[PDB]
């Protein structure tokens, strides 16, 4: 109870601290400085964390990175789309 | 062993994906567009995670948040100095 309470408090603060910038970026679609490669690595760690949570039976590390997956994944997808739009625009 | 192997792989990628940007910002001291508050929140969870790693004997989540603390703490310390320096200069 004490351990899980502490972890959920740790969870909440880590994933939701900089979440407004992810949400803002998704809405605004301003991916001008975003690194595609740096997000790929980040997401690789995230999916792995989910797997690590399943193995160790840890709710906190599971729920945290599952949410952090869903906040970062669209940012990566949108960033890739914007670059693709740049490729076609430059090609024209 | 195989489980701890998975955690370290997860740890390495998450804490070192965006580490270059923090190291960059530390040296350049360009703390413009950096939230004091959002970093306050961040580091609070980090230390809480450190406490969680101790509590559940999870080596992987502990060292992950240990290192991540040394990437973030200088950024907040430096951005406080910058905002301070801007304030007295403006005054």
Numbering used by the authors:
A (entry chain B): 2 to 93
B (entry chain A): 2 to 92
Give passages from the manuscript.
We also obtained a crystal belonging to the different space group C2 (Crystal-II), and the structure was determined at 3.0 Å resolution by molecular replacement, using a protomer in Crystal-I as the search model. The asymmetric unit contains four EcSemiSWEET molecules organized into two separate dimers. Whereas the conformation of one dimer is almost identical to that of the inward-open state in Crystal-I, the other dimer adopts a markedly different conformation. In this alternative conformation, the extracellular halves of the protomers are separated from each other, while the intracellular halves approach the central axis. Consequently, the central cavity formed by the dimer is open towards the extracellular side. Hence, we designated this structure as the outward-open state. In the outward-open conformation, Phe19, Met39, Tyr40 and Phe43 of the two protomers form a cluster of aromatic and hydrophobic residues through van der Waals interactions. These interactions seal off the substrate-binding pocket from the intracellular environment. The temperature factors for the two conformations in Crystal-II implied that the outward-open conformation is inherently less stable than the inward-open conformation, suggesting that EcSemiSWEET probably prefers the inward-open conformation in the lipid environment. As the inward-open and outward-open conformations were simultaneously captured in Crystal-II in the absence of any sugars, the transition between these two conformations could spontaneously occur even without any substrates.
